[PDB]
């Protein structure tokens, strides 16, 4: 029961790292050069 609990702590920051990354991914789209894809 100690083993699963540190995995939950190892998972809770893991998704927390991802949410910081996913917000950062939107910043590439927020500021990028798109002149070839006029569409």
């Amino acid at each position: 029961e100690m083993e699963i609990l540190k995995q939950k702590y190892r998972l809770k920051d893991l998704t927390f790292l991802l949410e910081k990354q996913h917000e950062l991914i939107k910043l590439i789209i927020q500021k990028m050069e798109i002149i070839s894809e006029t569409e």
């Binding site: 939107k26 789209i29 927020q30 006029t38 569409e39």
Partner: protein, 34 residues
Amino acid sequence: KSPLHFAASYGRINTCQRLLQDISDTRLLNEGDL
């Protein structure tokens, strides 16, 4: 049209200001996609 549906769906704020300098234009402002 489709540029505005693209740019507004992603927060590209500067092109959103650029396309909306057309005054008295509202038909493309509230048009829908598929």
